[PDB]
Design an enzyme around this catalytic site. Structure first.
Site, short mmCIF file in Angstrom:
data_model
loop_
_atom_site.label_atom_id
_atom_site.label_comp_id
_atom_site.label_asym_id
_atom_site.label_seq_id
_atom_site.Cartn_x
_atom_site.Cartn_y
_atom_site.Cartn_z
N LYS B 77 0.94 -1.61 -0.01
CA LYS B 77 0.41 -0.05 -0.01
C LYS B 77 1.26 1.30 -0.08
CE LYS B 77 -2.79 1.50 3.35
NZ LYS B 77 -3.80 2.04 3.82
N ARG B 121 -11.63 -0.81 5.92
CA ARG B 121 -11.02 -2.17 6.82
C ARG B 121 -10.37 -1.78 8.02
NH1 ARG B 121 -5.71 0.55 8.12
NH2 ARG B 121 -4.23 0.17 6.77
N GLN B 149 -13.00 8.89 7.95
CA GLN B 149 -12.82 7.83 8.73
C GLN B 149 -13.88 7.79 10.02
OE1 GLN B 149 -10.43 5.28 7.80
NE2 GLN B 149 -9.88 7.13 6.48
N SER B 210 -7.23 14.38 12.39
CA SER B 210 -5.91 15.14 11.90
C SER B 210 -5.44 15.74 12.83
CB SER B 210 -6.46 15.67 10.13
OG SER B 210 -7.46 16.72 10.57
N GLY B 234 -6.87 8.07 15.16
CA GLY B 234 -5.88 8.71 14.39
C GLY B 234 -4.78 8.97 14.51
N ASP B 236 -0.06 8.75 12.49
CA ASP B 236 0.57 9.71 10.67
C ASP B 236 1.41 10.13 11.44
OD1 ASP B 236 -0.58 12.62 11.48
OD2 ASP B 236 -2.53 12.02 11.80
N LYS B 240 2.38 12.89 17.42
CA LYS B 240 0.68 12.80 17.48
C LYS B 240 -0.23 11.85 18.58
CE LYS B 240 -3.23 12.99 14.70
NZ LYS B 240 -3.51 12.49 13.48
N1 LIG Z 1 -5.42 2.06 10.85
C1 LIG Z 1 -5.61 3.22 11.55
O1 LIG Z 1 -5.54 3.86 13.02
C2 LIG Z 1 -6.31 4.85 10.03
C3 LIG Z 1 -6.58 4.84 8.95
C4 LIG Z 1 -6.77 5.60 7.77
C5 LIG Z 1 -6.25 7.10 8.62
N2 LIG Z 1 -6.14 7.19 9.19
C6 LIG Z 1 -5.57 7.98 10.31
O2 LIG Z 1 -7.24 8.26 10.72
C7 LIG Z 1 -7.37 10.40 11.58
C8 LIG Z 1 -8.18 10.57 10.12
O3 LIG Z 1 -8.27 10.58 9.24
P1 LIG Z 1 -9.57 11.00 8.08
O4 LIG Z 1 -9.46 10.16 6.12
O5 LIG Z 1 -10.64 10.72 8.66
O6 LIG Z 1 -9.18 12.14 7.67
P2 LIG Z 1 -9.99 13.80 7.08
O7 LIG Z 1 -8.84 15.29 7.33
O8 LIG Z 1 -10.72 13.46 6.25
O9 LIG Z 1 -10.92 13.35 9.14
C9 LIG Z 1 -10.66 14.43 10.13
C10 LIG Z 1 -11.03 15.83 11.22
O10 LIG Z 1 -10.08 15.72 11.53
C11 LIG Z 1 -10.89 17.02 11.81
N3 LIG Z 1 -10.24 17.42 13.84
C12 LIG Z 1 -8.51 18.18 13.35
N4 LIG Z 1 -8.94 17.89 14.69
C13 LIG Z 1 -9.27 17.81 15.61
C14 LIG Z 1 -9.77 18.18 16.60
N5 LIG Z 1 -8.45 18.73 17.93
N6 LIG Z 1 -10.60 17.71 16.66
C15 LIG Z 1 -11.38 17.36 16.88
N7 LIG Z 1 -11.76 16.94 15.01
C16 LIG Z 1 -10.51 17.77 14.42
C17 LIG Z 1 -10.12 17.41 11.25
O11 LIG Z 1 -11.38 19.31 11.21
C18 LIG Z 1 -11.42 16.71 10.92
O12 LIG Z 1 -13.09 16.53 9.93
C19 LIG Z 1 -5.78 10.93 10.32
O13 LIG Z 1 -4.92 11.11 10.97
C20 LIG Z 1 -5.33 8.94 9.36
O14 LIG Z 1 -4.06 9.19 9.28
C21 LIG Z 1 -5.20 6.07 10.74
O1 LIG Z 2 -3.09 2.71 7.59
C1 LIG Z 2 -3.60 3.40 6.97
O2 LIG Z 2 -3.69 3.41 5.77
C2 LIG Z 2 -2.89 5.23 7.95
C3 LIG Z 2 -2.29 5.47 6.62
C4 LIG Z 2 -2.16 6.99 7.08
C5 LIG Z 2 -0.64 7.47 8.39
C6 LIG Z 2 -1.81 6.24 9.01
N1 LIG Z 2 -1.73 4.91 8.68
#
Ligand SMILES: NC(=O)c1ccc[n+]([C@@H]2O[C@H](COP(=O)([O-])OP(=O)(O)OC[C@H]3O[C@@H](n4cnc5c(N)ncnc54)[C@H](O)[C@@H]3O)[C@@H](O)[C@H]2O)c1
Ligand SMILES: O=C(O)[C@@H]1CCCCN1
Ligand SMILES: NC(=O)c1ccc[n+]([C@@H]2O[C@H](COP(=O)([O-])OP(=O)(O)OC[C@H]3O[C@@H](n4cnc5c(N)ncnc54)[C@H](O)[C@@H]3O)[C@@H](O)[C@H]2O)c1
Ligand SMILES: O=C(O)[C@@H]1CCCCN1
Lengths: 355, 346
Positions: B77, B121, B149, B210, B234, B236, B240
């Site tokens: 990925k 997933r 998410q 984010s 959350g 990245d 964080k």
């Molecule tokens: N497997 C995993 O754990 C995994 C997989 C995918 C994404 N992620 C992570 O999840 C997070 C969200 O991704 P997404 O695709 O939903 O992004 P996104 O940008 O669509 O949504 C993130 C949201 O967080 C909000 N935000 C920012 N700071 C905030 C705060 N202090 N309080 C409340 N809201 C806040 C933003 O305004 C935005 O709406 C990212 O850090 C991403 O890397 C994790």
């Molecule tokens: O597992 C994932 O796809 C996300 C990608 C961005 C960083 C955090 N993890």
């Protein structure tokens, strides 16, 4: 919102078209020129070597490796080559040992913008790198090229070198009789006369040698430590596994040795046999200040080539430019870009035909 | 011979053919089974992933995530986290693709979208953890972060728990405003609520924001329900975090990928010795989680390539069912393996 982005794909038919349309010689010269300038940039501190690449050792059928090689131009794009070294391939499956693709991602958004075959591009930029190094370190009247390993890389080694040196003969060896016997056919387009020669004769006669073999770990050298001509230059191209080497330690220790990527070479090139004090300045230094190569043409030199992603990025741009001029490739919407960026399920199906 | 490519139109056609709920359930089931394999030592956690940091327009990162099944295939990925994407470009924060290569030969056999797949997933992984660790009669979901998410967090959880309502917060008003529409398909009613209220009223929370490095927490340590389970999604960038330390220290914490979480997840704030059993162990032996549903729990989710491989396999099977995708000859497989200019007809 923004204009719809799609991935521009150049597969094997388009890459063939670029070769037919530009011409093999012109395409190789373009790659040589772009590499030369880029290495000099690195040599001046204007750009950086690619980070170390990563990989997964495979044990079966024969020890191999599958690697990912990133290069980032900040604010611009990220290049990632994904490439396997699978040396049982030609012998067990009829496939190239080196199989890969090169992808480019927008550095700003992360979008996959382009994707192409890595097989030809790899062969081209690897021959190009030997040409860059050999212009600097080979005698400019070199007439005899030696080749140890006469598989795929050997074809572009001969091609590139034939463009920068007045080559009259190529003396060639492979431990596989069928592979050395077909080389001449594969080499015909360069116009350089081919003779099968054992390694000892290659060592004794060549002005310039390229080693590019699939020798197994622990099983070198592929060129025996015997008599060489005083001014010999060798492009030591073969490399994959730690423990894989092609040249005799003794020979290296009589040579001016320059690596493409020192940190890498010191772990997986010929320089894995050497302590760092036995390396000269790296290729980028030589490109930026060729005076640094002074006097090295006339004595033994080795270019320790390992390959790095910056080379792939430059070669890819040559291909993209030529494909843009000639209207080649297909546009494929691979990534899902939902109309609402916050809704993974805002999906758009294939439109219905007009009834 | 060729690469099978599944694009944006083909993944749409997969979700239609299978149904949103069923596709989610399929992923939840494959993930449960696969994690259990890992928990029994039959399969291994993916290796730690690599990445390039990006500073503009706001800090993000682009990552490569490999998973090898020795002898069948290697999944890679490639995925960006670019949190200015939605507001600057109308693109998702998380933008990626997933590729499959033959382990034996190295050839590229398939390539598909990573955006939907990642959201699915990731929802699924939270559903896995929440079935183990949330009260089975949980009715109130909390969401901090209502971006992409959050949609599949709600969706997946709505499928394993009897959720009736969601209390939601985002620091961007326009993003919390639109959530109810994005969630309406699930039948779960949505209400905007401040983080202190979500903490007091939720049975189960997912945090998926984010937030910037050093700007946590996104949920205050202000009083929670006894049985609360949090999916901490959350992440990245190193540095964080989303949760308050006082809360992590009182919790039963399970990580998806412990080594990774200790570097990049909430477990950044903890030592290894304070974690409970990893999620794979809990899936292999669910009885090990007994009693944790009724006390404070945290699933520290970071994402790892094994989850992407498994999801990709679900898509591929559905697409094969329906002859979806194109085949493109990308790689130059010269008939003559030794000739890189052996191209190629007729
Ligand atoms: N497997 C995993 O754990 C995994 C997989 C995918 C994404 N992620 C992570 O999840 C997070 C969200 O991704 P997404 O695709 O939903 O992004 P996104 O940008 O669509 O949504 C993130 C949201 O967080 C909000 N935000 C920012 N700071 C905030 C705060 N202090 N309080 C409340 N809201 C806040 C933003 O305004 C935005 O709406 C990212 O850090 C991403 O890397 C994790
Ligand atoms: O597992 C994932 O796809 C996300 C990608 C961005 C960083 C955090 N993890
Ligand atoms: N940039 C780089 O430095 C770079 C780029 C591409 C490939 N490579 C490497 O170069 C090597 C060659 O790649 P290829 O694509 O030409 O592979 P190939 O399989 O096409 O050719 C390798 C040839 O080496 C022969 N060989 C094996 N052991 C030998 C020996 N002891 N003496 C003589 N010949 C021998 C084989 O029979 C075969 O014909 C590999 O190690 C590969 O990883 C390096
Ligand atoms: O740079 C390259 O493309 C090769 C791939 C195989 C291992 C060594 N170098």
């Amino acid at each position: 919102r923004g204009s719809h982005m799609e991935t521009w794909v150049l597969g094997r038919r388009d890459v063939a078209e670029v070769v037919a349309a530009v011409g093999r010689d012109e395409l190789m010269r373009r790659i040589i020129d772009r590499l030369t300038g880029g290495l000099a940039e690195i040599g001046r501190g204007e750009r950086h070597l690619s980070p170390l690449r990563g990989g997964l050792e495979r044990s079966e059928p024969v020890p191999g490796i599958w690697e990912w090689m990133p290069h980032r131009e900040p604010g611009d794009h990220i290049t990632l080559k994904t490439v396997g070294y699978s040396p049982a391939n030609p012998a067990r499956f009829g496939l190239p040992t080196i199989l890969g693709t090169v992808a480019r991602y927008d550095d700003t958004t992360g979008a996959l913008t382009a994707l192409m075959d890595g097989v030809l591009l790899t062969a081209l930029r690897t021959g190009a790198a030997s040409a860059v190094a050999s212009r600097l370190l080979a005698r400019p009247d070199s007439h005899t090229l030696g080749l140890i390993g006469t598989g795929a890389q050997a074809v572009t080694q001969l091609h590139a070198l034939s463009l920068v040196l007045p080559l009259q003969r190529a003396l060639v060896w492979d431990t596989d009789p069928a592979h050395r016997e077909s080389f001449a056919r594969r080499a015909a387009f360069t116009g350089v006369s081919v003779e099968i020669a054992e390694p000892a004769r290659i060592a004794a006669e060549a002005d310039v040698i390229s080693t590019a073999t699939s020798v197994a770990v622990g099983q070198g050298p592929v060129l025996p430590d015997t008599g060489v001509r005083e001014h010999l230059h060798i492009n030591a191209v073969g490399a994959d596994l730690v423990g894989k080497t092609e040249l005799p330690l003794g020979l290296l220790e009589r040579a001016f040795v320059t690596a493409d990527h020192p940190e890498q070479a010191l772990r997986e090139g010929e320089c894995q046999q050497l302590s760092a004090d036995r390396l000269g300045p790296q290729l980028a230094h030589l490109c930026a200040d060729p005076a640094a190569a002074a006097g090295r043409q006339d004595t033994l030199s080795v270019f320790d080539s390992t390959g790095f992603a910056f080379e792939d990025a430059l070669a890819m741009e040559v291909f993209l430019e030529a494909a843009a001029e000639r209207d080649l490739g297909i546009r494929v919407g691979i990534e899902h870009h939902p109309g609402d960026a916050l809704d993974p399920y805002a999906l758009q199906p294939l439109p219905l035909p007009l009834a």
